[PDB]
């Protein structure tokens, strides 16, 4: 009908006008007198061996000592970073795994992939072994990311254009967030666990609120898929990485774009992004086997974590900001510092 | 310079490492095949001869074949295809009886072109299966092949199945210096549909071994 043709267009024009009218200056202009961070040099302090295939995801424990890694060889390993010892090695039922998570309390872990099912494993058992605590089903596409709200809730996103908030004990879909138009490739949870953002192959990001379960803001500007997304520690900004070789910093409160991190020599697509504890650095893992460190407030490269022989698939920063773990397709995790 | 608990933890880690190595060695001696098709193009029949991913295991001449079917994935194909980068062969199912219904053969040709020239599958041989031989002959008895291939110019007999159908599908691999295509006609009941896969896999494995040796 004519409504879809005209009302949507005029509302979009109004949104554009409102966004433009609320742009007094740019972040670059404001942060012109800030002294540059200077060259950043990081050396591989630990290398973790034991995976026999590509690594597709990893997550740091809440205590910044234990981490979990998932690969296509069908194993989910838990490493003690300080000494590189192995604490657990869970054999998955389906070897097509494309995500993993670590519960904040450290009891459970989660994983999923091409089987469209999210498996939740329990670590603290009286029998001394690790057994599947629960299996959550109800997604009609591959599952690409999962994060723990707490010991009894979890949010997942799949290649179905929908996100779902579950209830582990009952095993049902407590809430379903819909509105995208393409595969949802990653999501991040706000520090206060009240809002969360998701980026999709629609070339856009959306900000949902967990309680009411409804879209609240849509951020556009990219020109291709989005493969990663992360919140700014403050909780009022998030950074997205796409396939057009460019990162972007979006602001929730201003409802606009702030800055874009790109370089002419870079043509490959990003696979993961993360922030530093103070939010003054933005680490991004590219597809050319490198991993750059951008000055978040100036968009000037400050270093390069070149130590991998294949794609950098996963990237993470500890809770206390003392280490950076990068896992690549050569079946290696490296902890810098 | 380590406490007793630390030494026990190191011992446990070494045991876990041994178990992981043994499992990897066991799993590296298996043949992996990826099955692709245009839909209801005889896939079920081929599976019979031997949610999401569907895995089928079978054994032949002391070899373990794992066949992965991805028919249930309606999402974008360019975001999870790179998972299957190490597969040793891509079985492709096509129906010669679809040249009349609707055009379907053009869709199969487009899918074959997309898969065969993918960045990741630049070194994996393709085993091509042509199905519904008897039905195709029965239909070509009356309908002509020009309905689907207007440029075709030849007699209307099953002997022209190997011509302008096999040739058309084998002409799409624009990188002929690194991968090979094996085509085999099949029917409802042949009993040799698994021998052909064995021969193709043996050739691929010989090539891989020679390449690893450096001779190539």
């Amino acid at each position: 009908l004519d409504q879809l043709r005209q009302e949507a267009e005029q509302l979009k024009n109004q949104i554009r006008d409102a966004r433009k009218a609320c742009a007094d200056a740019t972040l670059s202009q404001i942060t012109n007198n800030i002294d540059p961070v200077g060259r950043i040099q990081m050396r591989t302090r630990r290398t973790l061996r034991g995976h026999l295939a590509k690594i597709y995801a990893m997550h740091w424990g809440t205590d910044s000592r234990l981490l979990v890694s998932a690969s296509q060889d069908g194993k989910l390993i838990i490493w003690d970073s300080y000494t590189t010892n192995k604490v657990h090695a869970i054999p998955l039922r389906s070897s097509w795994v494309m995500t993993c998570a670590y519960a904040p309390s450290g009891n459970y872990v989660a994983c999923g992939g091409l089987d469209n099912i999210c498996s939740i494993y329990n670590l603290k058992t009286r029998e001394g072994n690790v057994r599947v605590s629960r299996e959550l089903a109800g997604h009609t596409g591959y599952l690409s990311c999962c994060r723990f709200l707490d010991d009894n809730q979890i949010v997942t996103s799949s290649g179905d254009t929908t996100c779902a908030l579950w209830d582990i004990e009952t095993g049902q879909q407590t809430t379903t967030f819909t509105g995208h138009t393409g595969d949802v490739m990653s999501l991040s949870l706000a520090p206060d666990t009240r809002l969360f953002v998701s980026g999709a192959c629609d070339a856009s990001a959306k900000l949902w609120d967990v309680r009411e379960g409804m879209c609240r803001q849509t951020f556009t500007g990219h020109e291709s898929d989005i493969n990663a997304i992360c919140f700014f520690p403050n909780g009022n900004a998030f950074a997205t990485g796409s396939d057009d070789a460019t990162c972007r910093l979006f602001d929730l409160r201003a409802d606009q774009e702030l800055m874009t991190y790109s370089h002419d020599n870079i043509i490959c697509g990003i696979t993961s992004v993360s922030f530093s504890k103070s939010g003054r650095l933005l680490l991004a893992g590219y597809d050319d086997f490198n991993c750059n460190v951008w000055d978040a407030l100036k968009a000037d490269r400050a270093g390069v974590l070149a130590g991998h022989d294949n794609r950098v698939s996963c990237l993470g920063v500890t809770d206390d900001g003392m280490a950076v773990a990068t896992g690549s397709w050569d079946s290696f995790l490296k902890i810098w510092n | 310079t380590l406490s007793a608990e630390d030494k026990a933890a190191v011992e446990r880690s070494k045991m876990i490492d041994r178990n992981l190595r043994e499992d990897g060695e066991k799993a590296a001696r298996e043949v992996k095949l990826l099955l692709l098709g245009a839909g209801e193009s005889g896939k079920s029949t081929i599976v019979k001869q031997m949610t999401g991913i569907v895995e089928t295991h079978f054994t032949f001449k002391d070899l373990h074949f794992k066949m992965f079917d991805v028919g249930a994935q309606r999402s974008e194909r360019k975001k999870w295809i790179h998972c299957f980068e190490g597969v040793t062969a891509i079985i492709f199912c096509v129906a010669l009886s679809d040249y009349d219904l609707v055009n379907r053969m053009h869709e199969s040709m487009k899918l074959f072109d997309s898969i065969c020239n993918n960045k990741w599958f630049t070194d994996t041989s393709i085993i091509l299966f042509l199905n519904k031989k008897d039905l195709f002959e029965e239909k070509i008895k009356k309908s002509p092949l020009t309905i689907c291939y207007p440029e075709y110019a030849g007699s209307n007999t099953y002997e022209e199945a190997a011509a302008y159908i096999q040739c058309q599908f084998e002409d799409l691999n624009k990188r002929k210096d690194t991968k090979e295509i094996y085509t085999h006609f099949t029917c409802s009941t042949d009993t040799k549909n698994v021998q052909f896969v064995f021969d193709a896999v043996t050739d691929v494995i010989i090539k891989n071994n020679l390449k690893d040796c450096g001779l190539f």
Partner: single-chain antibody, 233 residues
Framework: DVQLVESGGGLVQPGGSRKLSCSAS????????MHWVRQAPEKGLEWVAY????????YYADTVKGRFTISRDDPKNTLFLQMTSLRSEDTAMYYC??????????????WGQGTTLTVSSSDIVMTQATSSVPVTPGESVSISCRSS???????????LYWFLQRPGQSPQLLIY???NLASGVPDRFSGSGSGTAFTLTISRLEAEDVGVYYC?????????FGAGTKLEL
């Protein structure tokens, strides 16, 4: 349910031989190291042997070196201890303890039930000055344990375990590493102290708390237990 049941005890003559068996049901016996711990008739506990997971490590006490043998059979989930050339000082009640070692784990969670054996005719010295302490319910109590050598390793951990043994029962773990609280223990119990001086505090004391409290070290493998403090009334 998790349980260990043990057998092979009875009268024996000096110079004889005997075998003790401990059967485990309810947990992954293949991933747990196993200790054999003695308990004299009316005295404190004493460590007798240790066998690791995979049988790659075996340790014996200096008093039974070369005289006892310890083995495990995973397929049938059994633990064997062969004793040869018994002496009149070997009369005791042997236990069967489990322990799994990994970061954040808890050793000595479960104790067996005990088989009574009767025979007819450099080490850290943990000290427990107090022996008897009369206490009334509703009050708070403190138990002090001292060691001959500092128990604070370079890792920052401090290996010091507190066990409780009620009358006519096997000991149960209360605290591991002087701070952590064993699973299932009420929150009243707490532990504190620096190297070479440790204390355990109970705030509200209930009827089901009378027993004997033992403090053990885990730094050097010739494990040593304290004399033991008992609470009365």
């Amino acid at each position: 349910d998790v349980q260990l049941v043990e057998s092979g005890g009875g009268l024996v003559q000096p110079g004889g031989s005997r075998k003790l068996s401990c059967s485990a049901s309810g947990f992954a016996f293949s991933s747990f190291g196993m200790h054999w711990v003695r308990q004299a008739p009316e005295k404190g506990l004493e460590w007798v042997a240790y066998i690791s997971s995979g049988s790659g490590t075996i340790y014996y006490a200096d008093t039974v070196k070369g005289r006892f043998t310890i083995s495990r059979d995973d397929p049938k989930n059994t633990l064997f201890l062969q004793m040869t050339s018994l002496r009149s000082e070997d009369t005791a009640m042997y236990y069967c303890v489990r322990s799994i070692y990994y970061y954040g784990s808890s050793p000595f969670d479960f104790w067996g039930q005990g088989t009574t054996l009767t025979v007819s005719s450099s080490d850290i010295v943990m000290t427990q000055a107090t022996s008897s302490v009369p206490v009334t319910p509703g009050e708070s109590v403190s138990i002090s344990c001292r060691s001959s050598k500092s128990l604070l390793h370079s890792n920052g951990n401090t290996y010091l375990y507190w066990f409780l043994q009620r009358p006519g029962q096997s000991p149960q773990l209360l605290i591991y590493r002087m701070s952590n609280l064993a699973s299932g223990v009420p929150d009243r119990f707490s532990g504190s102290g620096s190297g070479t001086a440790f204390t355990l505090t109970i705030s509200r004391l209930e009827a089901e708390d009378v027993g004997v409290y033992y403090c053990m070290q885990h730094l050097e493998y010739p494990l040593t237990f304290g004399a033991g403090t008992k609470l009365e009334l």
